[PDB]
Amino acid sequence: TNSKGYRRGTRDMFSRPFRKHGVIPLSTYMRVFKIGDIVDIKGHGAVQKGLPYKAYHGKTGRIFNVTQHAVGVIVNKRVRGKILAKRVNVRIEHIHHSKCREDFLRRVKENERLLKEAKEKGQWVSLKRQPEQPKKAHFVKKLEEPIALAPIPYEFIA
Amino acid sequence: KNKQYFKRYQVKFRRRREGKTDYYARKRLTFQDKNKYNTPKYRLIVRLSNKDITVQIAYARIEGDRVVCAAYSHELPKYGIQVGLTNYAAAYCTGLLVARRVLNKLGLDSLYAGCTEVTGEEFNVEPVDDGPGAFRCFLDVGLARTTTGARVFGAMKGAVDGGLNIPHSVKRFPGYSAETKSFNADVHRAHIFGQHVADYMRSLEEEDEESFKRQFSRYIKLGIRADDLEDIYKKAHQAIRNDPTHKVTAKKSSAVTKKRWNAKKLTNEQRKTKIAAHKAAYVAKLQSET
Amino acid sequence: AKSKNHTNHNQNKKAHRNGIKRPLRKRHESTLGMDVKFLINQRYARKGNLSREESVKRYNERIASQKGKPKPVTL
Amino acid sequence: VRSFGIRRNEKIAVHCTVRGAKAEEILERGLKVREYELRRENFSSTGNFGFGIQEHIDLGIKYDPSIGIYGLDFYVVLGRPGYNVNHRKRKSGTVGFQHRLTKEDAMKWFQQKYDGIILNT
Amino acid sequence: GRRPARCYRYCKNKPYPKSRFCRGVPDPKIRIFDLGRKKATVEDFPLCVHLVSDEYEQLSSEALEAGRICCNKYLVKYCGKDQFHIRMRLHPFHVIRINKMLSCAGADRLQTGMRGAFGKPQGTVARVRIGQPIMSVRSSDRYKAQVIEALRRAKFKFPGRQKIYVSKKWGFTKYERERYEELRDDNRLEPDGCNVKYRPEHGPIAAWEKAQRDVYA
Amino acid sequence: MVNVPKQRRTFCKKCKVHKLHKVTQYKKSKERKGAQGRRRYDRKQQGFGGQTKPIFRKKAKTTKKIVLRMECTECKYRKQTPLKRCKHFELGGDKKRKGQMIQF
RNA sequence: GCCAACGACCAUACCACGCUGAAUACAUCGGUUCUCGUCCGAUCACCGAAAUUAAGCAGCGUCGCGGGCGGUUAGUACUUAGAUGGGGGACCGCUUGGGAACACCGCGUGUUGUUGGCCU
RNA sequence: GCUGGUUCCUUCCGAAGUUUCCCUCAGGAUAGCUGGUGCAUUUUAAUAAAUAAUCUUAUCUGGUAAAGCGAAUGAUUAGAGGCCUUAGGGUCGAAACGAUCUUAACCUAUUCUCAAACUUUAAAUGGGUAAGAACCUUAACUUUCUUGAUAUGAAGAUCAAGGUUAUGAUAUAAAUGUCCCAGUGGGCCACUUUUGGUAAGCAGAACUGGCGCUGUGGGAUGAACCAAACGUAAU
RNA sequence: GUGAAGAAAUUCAAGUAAGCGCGGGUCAACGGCGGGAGUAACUAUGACUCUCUUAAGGUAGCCAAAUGCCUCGUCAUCUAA
RNA sequence: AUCUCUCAAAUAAUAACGGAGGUGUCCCAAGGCCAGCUCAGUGCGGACAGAAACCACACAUAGAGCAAAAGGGCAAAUGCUGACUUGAUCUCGGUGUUCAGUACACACAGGGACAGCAAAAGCUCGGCCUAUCGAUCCUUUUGGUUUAAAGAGUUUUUAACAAGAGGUGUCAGAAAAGUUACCAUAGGGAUAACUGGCUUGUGGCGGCCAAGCGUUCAUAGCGACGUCGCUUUUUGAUCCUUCGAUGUCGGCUCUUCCUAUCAUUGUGAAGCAAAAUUCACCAAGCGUUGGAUUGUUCACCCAUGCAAGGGAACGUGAGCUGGGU
């Protein structure tokens, strides 16, 4: 009859997944985050002074706090419906980077350079993003082994 | 026993196997305040062997740890010190070495002259005004115990007397009697000038010839009597204050692929044929009996 | 009297009738609940940016007054 | 354990450790009491062993009947110099099969010097 | 209280445990899960046959015991006592969910209209997927007419539709019969009680070499 | 049992340093009439109304959150802080001896 | 090709066993007057080297364990979506698209930072 | 706070049966939905280089199926392999300490099955941010600072260079402050997913669609089934 | 009402009667008035013996009574049953 | 009110008087923090030495410990031991989960202070994190050394602000024992007893395979152990309809239909000689009683009978009766 309160429902979430227990790495005690370096909020089991509570874990956010050994985030969570902002304070080793910006920054500097090579011939930019297309119309020699090549099933009886 | 015991096992990392760090000091050593972003914390490293004591200056980064300054007792042969490379007297000049070697790097050779005439002076250097903020330094004890009288503080002592900047207290010094100071400040004048060792030559000067055949050996091999030890230090210290040579070396080189030398690792063709050299022998040991 | 209760039925459908609407959108967001100062340290520097044409170039000759900055390349 | 009226924290017994320049004389004061042609086990495979005695007066001490008679057990630890690598503070590693001892190594050392024959009894 | 058999044709209650937390569990009397000559080697019984069903059918604990006894009496009256290896491959760990209705005699007079509705254990049942082999016999090849014509009288204790497989394995092992022969012939199949040894090559040498020794000498 | 030291050195609101203080109790401080409430409950029961302001049954807590006044030894200032809900209590402390067996 | 110090990623880096290790070294080893802890100078501590390459450590070997990683298992299992699709229900067959895993086979057995120094 | 009646027509729009709190559990306040009242404005408002919503692209995110016991945590069936010396019956032996099986232990290799409160990996559906001019690089200025001697760094103001603005498809128009605006705070059902119970046209739910509010063509019939959601008219 | 402090409202002191508690009396005043084992030349019993505990242990008589859940008691009789 | 593990369908959220539990404590060390030093076990050991103590040495991935339930973390620690100390501190406002993004509470990051250990860096604003708890009114301390008492002082009293505490466990807070077969009312099917309704654990009710019995003979008739199926007579279930009223239990009288057939018509079976009787198919046509106690359905009698079977709209009170209820 309960959630209500403060750490219930942490079966596979809040601990350490397999073969990573014990002493923390020291890479994540080194990282640096400016204002606007978009970052994630996730779970941990090796700094037991601080957590993001039962709903947040698995969400990412902006950073507008720079402090002693903490990070204060903006994050969106579902109320019904007034989806608000929330300011959560947390010690740093709960937190991983976004890599979702980390494709986009090399989407920038290619476009500053591929326009820069375009600045000698003019046409054309072609600088937006497009997924795969309907391709072509080949003609295909066998070339490699003419047809039939006939796999027809018969397998049930066992 | 213990078959599947390997499967759920995992380790403590690499330097815990070879006993190099602790990960408990260093993390809360290099726990940089995050408000400062990547201004380095710049700790000082001192490690020791049975023959040598070492002095490093390093700082952490994201990939690892750049070590800007280094020292050994191996350089002290250039400064008139032949033997006794694990003395508290020897601990002083080693910390004194890098204490101006960084001052050649940043050009602060004039300012922060440090404690000049050392007779055991508790001299924290003052932060000067109107110009260069002094380069602070932090102390690591590595894995050794920081008891009152450890030799690692002697490496700090030449560092703090050379102009380096440390939040530094005095209760862990050798000779400062823990019940109760009573700061006998002249005990480091016996420490830094090696008199605590130089008496042991003199108090064994007439008792055992075999004492010299025992420890403080090779002083007899160079005629080092128990009288002139402090002036070897004092002449080294001004020469340390003259210039550290910054370890120029230009052999360049006899290093590469000598000779092989470490048993290149026997690929798949020489693995299974070595098995094939071993498989055909065992059927031959059965074909011998019939 | 156990009739039917506790239940989240239809309640979502009535929320997606007015759109779900990330708060507003803003540019110069508020600054509250931080380090309280840091914040007023900017207030000094907010009083500092006086020159776009007058003092911005006077220091550049004074850069060369100390024959450049060859020494402090690490610190 | 309630079996003998003895509890936690009792200060039940006395012990000590002795190493270097003093152990080699108190052992040979015991080997005459031990009649040092000792039995087979009396021995562990670690390369160290020990024994237990009655009548602790006969190692050249005064009896002094105010003190009492006492049966004693002993355990001397042989080794190889370099064994402190399992017990040093830093760079501390184990041994392997060598220089780690077997029961024969002490049984060699028991029979070569002090001439203690093994008494496989 | 030994409720009738129709009430558990469907696994629709939860996959239950048997805990070290709840005391009060009665006895599942199935203390035998295999009959026949269990002391036989693999070479004694080349033939294999199972008995299997075709649903997600829940199977009661009781006809397992009937499945023990009924085919036992036919096989001890037909083709010798020890000429087979009966195996009922299935453990009833699942529990059924009962309130007992001994609310009589007047001196108690409240318990439950349906407030509340906790459970108590009275027996066990078994949960069967599709093609889950249940009742199997490992015998010689000369009694195929003995087992299946005894297996009729066990199929009519396990409910619903059931098909009958004749294996092509060599007994209860995990190996096909024609596959069984050629790898046995040198060293690669080492005999055991009900099974064999898969590939003694790894390792690293001497176990292959000790198996190399006794087949030569 | 809550052993407490007889002396402690905490924040003093006057000296603005840490100095030794003393610590005592609160016990009850009997309702000294005729206070402002006291001159109203005694006012509204001059006769024939019968117990309007409710005098309270239904006891709940098995022990009260005890408090300890913290008198500064230096400048005689007194302060206050609660301590948590424990039935047993004593000051002075009778300091616990760790690791000793029960004698006899 | 190494060695040290500091590391970093923290098993391809581990463990069992066997073998080697030039130099630099690391160590091992030795003493107890002072610092100094000690029941115990063994662990700690101060002094420094006679002896040592045995161990440790490094390097390597094992159809070694372990782990990394590939290929098949397998479009199988489950599955979002759809139906005037059957069946007595149980449960399954199709349309729609994502799509596994242990086992089973193979390959691999530390990569590297800066700081020095060594030179087979 | 409980029942009865709450009277003229058309047009427009069109819900509730929920969370909390309460000597409340038949009622009220509360947000929620709705309606009204305008008002500010986009080459997304008047004769795009700016947005807000679904997929893509990229990036994190979880242990449910499916598995998994020849790993833990348990629980669990079969024998086998044994130097065994834990050894129970013995045996050739005074016992055997000589010797010999057997039976209990044990280990080694397995093997039959399992898990709502067991996990070594692990899906689809659905969570989360991001897909630039509110940019992107560059200067030297700013800092009354705890940090740091470039009196670095961080952020700030201000110049320098800059393509066509950076995934698809749209916008029946987007954007907000009051009245806290009348109501309503009892619900029902089918598919999958699913507890309680043997169970039911019973109860108890999460995710949708519908019924109440809704006529309708179709299984004669029937609030939900399946077609389709209802200005007056001919084809 | 009498005392002491206190500039005073007030603070306590000495007090302090009847009630209830405290000591008896009372049930033709309300209302009460137990179980446990053992034990007799068959068995069965319990004349008895021990122990438990209470304000004291249902006494003289009645009865499946109009009042005995078990009830359609066990036994003759009235009865063709 | 309140805490966990699931129940929960891999974001979070969430149900019933669903499952397993827990809490109203406890600790000046079980706190704060530096220091050393690693446990569960298990092997070989060692006078008295087993389940016995104690020392030694190896293997010891945590199989322990951590005040308490259960999860989670935990290996030169967050444990063992030791040192030394009060941050279980004053202060200001924001922020986390309860949700109306309220209040209490509890955690969390700061800014300022005062310190406490550690050589330093650091660590510390209470128990390693998920529980270990409360609002006005007052009573009441601690308070500046504080203003108010309204004409002006002085002095005491109260009065106020500010931090707590005394208190509200029905946990956002009334002070609170009974029953009415004399009971009078607003109403309710949001809520039963009665009548119908889907369901059938219950019971009447058949099928199947045959372990056996039947002298032999499994199957004449039987059929255990287990296997799976219909009816609505009851027996509960449930609350769907009627609470501004559906006259609700028996017997009498009385039409009726019903097969799962008692016996009569036509067969067949047999351990069917006959007589007698049993099985089983088809068969609702007339038949299924007269009495003792009870208020009865049944129950059990006595007798007829060459022989006495079950059932339906609770059949039926403007047909009665009223014996119970």
Add this chain to the structure above:
RNA sequence: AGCAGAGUGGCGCAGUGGAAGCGUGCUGGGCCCAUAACUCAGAGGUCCGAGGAUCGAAACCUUGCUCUGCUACCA
């Protein structure tokens, strides 16, 4: 279905965490002309079972087994 609970020496009871407690029987002797009574002495305990926590559990804890109490409904 909470709960008042109890189960201890042959039997009866007493025992609130440091003990195995009392009484009657039972067992032996003396005393007896022999039996009782009398007198001295001895003996008599998984504290209902399984666990919990700990310096130790009959007692503390819950859990099942046996057994009254004690009024309630109606898979």
